[PDB]
Every structure is written in C-alpha cells, then in structure tokens.
Write a protein that binds this ligand. Structure first.
Ligand code: HEM
Ligand code: HEM
Lengths: 145, 145
C-alpha cells in the first residue's frame, strides 16, 4: 500500500532527502523550470499532456509554465515537510495522485520524472545516493497510481 | 485586472501578511483544517462543490479533507513567497485561479473565504488590520476568476 511505501522511508533516506532539498528547494522558480524543461527535452512524448501550458519551449518566458513549475516545487515541499508522519504524507500523496489519475498518467509514466530529478540533483553535485533517495519518494506516489 | 490588484499590495500590506503568516503558517495541518471547516460551517451552500472529499463534517478524521487542507496552506505559502516579484505572484495566482474556474467558482464565492480567514486570524490574536491585509491578497485571485 501507499502507507507501506511511506513507512519504509528510513532515517538515512529522509536525511538525504532533506539535505538535498535544502539546496534544490531554495530556488523553486529556477530549479522548478529546469525540472520541467528537462522532462520535455528527454521525454518529448510527454509534451502533448501539457497543452494547457502553451509553447513549453519558451521556458522561463512562458508565464503558464513558470506558474506550473513553481507550484510543482511546493508539492515537493509539502512531501518533504510530511516525512516524519506517514499518515500525513499518505493523505497529501493521494491528493496529488488524483491530480494525475484524472490526466491518465500511469505509475510508469510518472516515473519518467526520475531522470530529470537525477540531472537537477547532479547540477548541484548531489550524486547517485541522492538520486536513489528521491526515487524512493517518487515510488510512494507510484504506489498510489 | 490582476495586475492592478497585485499593485495594491503595498509595503505595509506585505509586512502584515508576512508577520501573520509566520504564525498561522506554522501549523498548516491544524489551521488548514480550521479554515476549511469554518468555511463549510459558515457557508453551508458551498459544501456541494466539495463532493470529492466525502463527509466534510468529519473534519480532521477525514483523510481527503486533511490532504486537501494541508495542500491549501501550501498555496498560501506560495503566494507569500512570491510577494517580492509581482510577475511571479501573478503567474501562480492565475494557475490556482484555473483550478477554481474549472470548478465553476466565481469571484464572489471565492471571496467567502474572507470570513473564515478573519476568524482563524482572530483566534491567534490578529485583528481586523490583518484580516484586511489578507482580503487584499484574496482580491488578487478574485481578479483572475
Ligand atoms: C515529482 C513529480 C511530480 C509532481 C510533484 C507533480 C506535481 C504536479 C502538480 C502540483 C500539478 C498541478 C495539479 C493541478 O492543479 O491540477 C501537476 C499537473 C500535471 N502533471 Fe505533474 N507532477 C509530477 C510528475 C509528472 C509527470 C512525470 C507527468 C507526466 C508524465 C505529469 C503530468 C502532469 C500533467 C499532464 C499535469 C496537468 C498540467 C495542466 O494542464 O495544468 N506530472 N503535477
Ligand atoms: C484562500 C483561498 C483558497 C485557496 C488558496 C484555495 C486553494 C485550493 C487548492 C490548492 C486546491 C486544489 C486544486 C486542485 O488540485 O485541483 C483547491 C481546490 C478546490 N477549491 Fe479552493 N482555495 C481557496 C478558496 C476556495 C473557496 C472559497 C471555494 C469555494 C467557495 C473553493 C473551492 C474549491 C473546490 C471545489 C476545489 C476542488 C476540491 C476537490 O475536489 O479536490 N476554494 N483550492
């Protein structure tokens, strides 16, 4: 279950998530847009899902993309803040899962975000250990999809 | 105009928003649920819009309501963090406006949140001065609906 996946996040994993977030989460606009644009660059097949945002190749200049990207980072902020209470983490994860289930995003497709996250982490010198920690957090959402 | 509304957020208004947020934003789960339940209690005619959350009278015990309420507080956190840059505040406000436009929520009904905000603030010893500051922020969202 989702609760199971959440309750598995160990102290070490939570430590790595918080340490890396202190950095990548410090510039939500810059890193949020980097995350989104990297997703579109490496997984062009996902562009169609974001038609509401207009021309995503416009990057930072696209106000709809910027608003979306900043907000995406607050969903992650939400997750990080709920790490010590699986019950709260689960209810917020399920909330965001619904947002994606309604758009027909499968657990497998949702996992496509791991590549971009790994790249954004690497830009700040956070290696594989950190990418693995984030993949575990993403897997909690996948358990709800 | 959302831009003219954003212009109403003067130095004094921004300070009052930040000062009060430091307190109410410290307990997102507790105050978020308080805000939502107050809205439902004082404006029963709005409960229909929240059909997805189930029995909202259950309050904190309702997992969907708790997830929704915590997330609502992160939307406010988002707004507060964008006060320095008008262009960024506008794009995030327009993003959330869409979430409500699709739910058929008008500017007038969105404004029904002012009562609950005033009550929650008052319980924390923040009077009319602060309630009015928050009404100006809510007015920016109203301009986009
Ligand atoms: C770290 C992972 C992710 C997080 C935290 C996340 C978060 C969000 C948030 C907060 C929204 C706005 C929800 C709303 O207001 O309706 C959203 C929308 C959306 N997401 Fe994600 N998302 C993630 C990954 C993905 C991936 C990998 C895909 C696609 C393969 C995806 C597809 C969508 C789509 C299509 C929308 C709707 C955009 C729109 O029309 O406004 N998301 N996401
Ligand atoms: C401070 C004011 C408010 C803020 C910041 C706010 C924020 C939010 C957020 C973040 C969501 C989730 C969007 C999504 O994922 O689709 C939401 C959903 C919603 N909001 Fe608000 N909201 C506010 C006031 C109101 C008011 C006053 C009403 C109604 C009179 C309203 C009606 C709704 C409805 C119907 C939903 C959909 C709930 C669901 O089915 O999940 N909101 N709001």
């Amino acid at each position: 279950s989702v609760y199971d996946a959440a309750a598995q996040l160990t102290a070490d994993v939570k430590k790595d998530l918080r340490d890396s977030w202190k950095v990548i989460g410090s510039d939500k606009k810059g890193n949020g847009v980097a995350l989104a644009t990297t997703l579109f660059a490496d997984n062009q097949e996902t562009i169609g899902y974001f038609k509401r945002l207009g021309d995503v190749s416009q990057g930072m200049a696209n106000d709809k993309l910027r608003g979306h990207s900043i907000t995406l980072m607050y969903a992650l902020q939400n997750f990080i803040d709920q790490l010590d209470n699986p019950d709260d983490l689960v209810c917020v994860v399920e909330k965001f899962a619904v947002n994606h289930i309604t758009r027909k995003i499968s657990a497998a497709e949702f996992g496509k975000i791991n590549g971009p996250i790994k790249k954004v982490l690497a830009s700040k010198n956070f290696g594989d250990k950190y990418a693995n920690a984030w993949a575990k957090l993403v897997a909690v959402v996948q358990a709800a999809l």
